[PDB]
Amino acid sequence: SEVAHRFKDLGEENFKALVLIAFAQYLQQCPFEDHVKLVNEVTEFAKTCVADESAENCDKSLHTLFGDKLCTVATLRETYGEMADCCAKQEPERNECFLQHKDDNPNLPRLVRPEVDVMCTAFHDNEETFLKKYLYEIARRHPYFYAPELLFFAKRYKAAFTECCQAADKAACLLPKLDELRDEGKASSAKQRLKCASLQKFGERAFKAWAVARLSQRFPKAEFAEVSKLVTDLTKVHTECCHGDLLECADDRADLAKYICENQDSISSKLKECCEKPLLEKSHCIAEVENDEMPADLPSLAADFVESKDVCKNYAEAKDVFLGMFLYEYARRHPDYSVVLLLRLAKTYETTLEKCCAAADPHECYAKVFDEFKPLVEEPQNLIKQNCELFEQLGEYKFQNALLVRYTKKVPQVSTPTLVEVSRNLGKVGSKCCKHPEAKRMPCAEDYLSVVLNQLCVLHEKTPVSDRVTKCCTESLVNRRPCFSALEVDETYVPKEFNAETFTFHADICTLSEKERQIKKQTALVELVKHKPKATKEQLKAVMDDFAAFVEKCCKADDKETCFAEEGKKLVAASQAA
Numbered sequence: 001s002e003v004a005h006r007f008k009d010l011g012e013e014n015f016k017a018l019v020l021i022a023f024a025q026y027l028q029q030c031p032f033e034d035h036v037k038l039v040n041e042v043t044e045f046a047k048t049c050v051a052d053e054s055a056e057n058c059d060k061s062l063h064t065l066f067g068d069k070l071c072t073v074a075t076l077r078e079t080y081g082e083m084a085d086c087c088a089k090q091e092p093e094r095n096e097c098f099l100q101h102k103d104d105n106p107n108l109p110r111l112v113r114p115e116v117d118v119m120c121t122a123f124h125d126n127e128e129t130f131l132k133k134y135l136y137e138i139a140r141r142h143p144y145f146y147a148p149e150l151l152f153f154a155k156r157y158k159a160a161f162t163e164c165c166q167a168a169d170k171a172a173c174l175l176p177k178l179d180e181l182r183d184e185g186k187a188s189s190a191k192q193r194l195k196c197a198s199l200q201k202f203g204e205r206a207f208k209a210w211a212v213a214r215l216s217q218r219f220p221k222a223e224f225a226e227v228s229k230l231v232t233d234l235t236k237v238h239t240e241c242c243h244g245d246l247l248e249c250a251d252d253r254a255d256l257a258k259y260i261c262e263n264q265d266s267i268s269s270k271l272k273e274c275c276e277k278p279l280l281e282k283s284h285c286i287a288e289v290e291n292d293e294m295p296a297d298l299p300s301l302a303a304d305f306v307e308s309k310d311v312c313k314n315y316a317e318a319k320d321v322f323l324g325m326f327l328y329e330y331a332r333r334h335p336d337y338s339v340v341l342l343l344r345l346a347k348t349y350e351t352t353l354e355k356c357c358a359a360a361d362p363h364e365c366y367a368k369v370f371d372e373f374k375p376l377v378e379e380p381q382n383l384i385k386q387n388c389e390l391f392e393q394l395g396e397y398k399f400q401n402a403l404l405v406r407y408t409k410k411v412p413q414v415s416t417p418t419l420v421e422v423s424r425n426l427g428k429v430g431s432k433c434c435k436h437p438e439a440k441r442m443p444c445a446e447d448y449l450s451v452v453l454n455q456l457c458v459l460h461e462k463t464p465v466s467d468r469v470t471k472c473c474t475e476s477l478v479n480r481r482p483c484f485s486a487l488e489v490d491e492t493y494v495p496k497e498f499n500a501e502t503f504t505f506h507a508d509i510c511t512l513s514e515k516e517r518q519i520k521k522q523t524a525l526v527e528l529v530k531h532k533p534k535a536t537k538e539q540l541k542a543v544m545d546d547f548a549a550f551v552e553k554c555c556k557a558d559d560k561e562t563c564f565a566e567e568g569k570k571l572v573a574a575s576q577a578a
């Protein structure tokens with residue numbers, strides 16, 4: 001029995017939660033109740049298997065068990081139409097079907113939260129249904145959320161209420177911690193989405209290179225053979241979570257935290273504080289540990305990778321290992337580069353060897369390979385310098401706008417919401433990274449950017465409207481950022497014709513928060529640009545300035561929110577003029 005296996009290892013608690021997550025991630029539109037029911041039923045069954053390891057179907061794989069349970073509600077096409085088809089299939093096929101139908105952008109109603117008085121009450125009364133609810137809501141809106149990490153967030157969520165509800169000014173103590181968590185959770189989700197994307201679209205060889213480079217930076221002292229071990233495991237971990245096998249992913253992850261902690265001295269010196277805490281925190285901790293100091297005396301790379309004469313020989317023997325080595329060697333001594341830059345130099349090296357080794361004089365051909373690295377390295381360094389300089393002037397909001405304009409001219413087809421979303425993030429890069437010293441800027445900047453571009457990629461893949469977006473997203477995981485930066489303005493885009501419905505002006509905007517105010521104000525700017533790709537900053541600003549006067553006046557006007565109707569049509573007139 002497998003269900004039993006996972007049960008003993010995780011225990012009632014975490015086993016129950018994980019399965020709730022898994023179900024919510026498969027049937028995102030299904031209600032809380034039903035899920036809870038299925039989870040419980042499923043849990044009961046497990047309990048019997050622990051006792052009798054052959055009872056009913058205790059000999060089954062989680063896929064069959066989990067698959068049949070959901071199918072007791074999925075067959076309801078009226079509710080989950082395209083799902084029924086999935087249940088009429090067999091294993092393992094019946095699952096891929098499920099994995100292929102996850103929505104990255106569910107049509108789920110915003111999730112507003114009641115006053116601090118109702119939450120604490122609901123929390124105190126029933127502490128189990130309050131947290132179960134939490135997981136459900138997150139997991140259904142983030143079908144790729146790193147499950148194990150979700151249990152981590154959960155523990156912190158509970159600690160929030162458990163504390164603030166016995167305070168003096170609940171709202172005061174709560175509100176903060178809850179915002180800080182809604183953010184940290186969004187980032188974590190993105191980070192993990194990229195990981196699943198890599199594995200899913202580019203293969204494990206690709207997820208691997210990424211880990212090798214990433215870990216090697218974190219753990220300079222570790223030895224290539226050690227890292228490889230870590231990389232091999234890590235992959236399986238994520239390979240599982242992304243493929244839907246949460247329980248085993250949850251297990252395996254622990255085993256990896258156990259090990260890394262046993263062999264501390266062989267890996268990093270900054271792991272101490274991580275291994276001394278509870279399991280969940282231990283894991284979260286290790287995953288976010290600062291790089292270790294760089295080993296004192298380190299030979300040069302040129303020695304064994306360009307100057308040696310057995311290069312082409314070693315390359316032909318086990319190119320995989322030789323390149324894996326090159327990457328590990330370049331990374332460890334360069335924590336100032338981004339994972340992608342590294343994988344980039346690596347790919348350059350490989351390509352070189354490939355052509356050189358088949359030449360009349362190898363060592364002569366691949367002799368000046370570090371010359372080629374020079375450009376690839378300075379590029380990001382320069383772009384990062386520019387962009388922070390700008391950001392440092394414009395501030396976050398105006399920086400987002402600049403970026404919003406630019407990307408819209410690049411891929412006008414892309415739906416306004418996505419472009420507004422994506423460009424808003426693309427700007428956080430500035431506030432998040434720019435405040436670091438050169439030595440730490442690039443990894444912060446370029447890898448974060450890799451996440452934000454993955455979003456645009458996935459969101460787009462749902463309904464592909466621009467081939468230029470498609471090319472850049474599918475051509476090379478490592479080269480996405482450069483590919484997008486190459487794009488100028490689409491010269492074949494034919495502007496849209498205005499419409500009353502293109503944008504509505506209900507007065508309901510005067511009630512929204514300050515943020516949702518900028519957001520409509522930005523959703524406009526996008527909209528404008530799609531109509532007049534050919535305007536420059538002068539007319540846009542001017543018009544945008546105006547759009548402001550409109551909301552202030554008409555919102556502060558005593559008339560029954562109709563100036564919105566009249567003045568709404570008034571601006572359209574002014575606008576078209578520019």
Ligand SMILES: CN1C(=O)CN=C(c2ccccc2)c2cc(Cl)ccc21
Nearest residue numbers: 380383387388426429430445446449
């Ligand atoms: C989103 N974005 C761009 O499109 C311009 N290119 C970059 C960039 C260029 C090279 C590496 C990483 C990032 C960049 C840099 C900052 Cl500091 C802020 C936004 C931004």
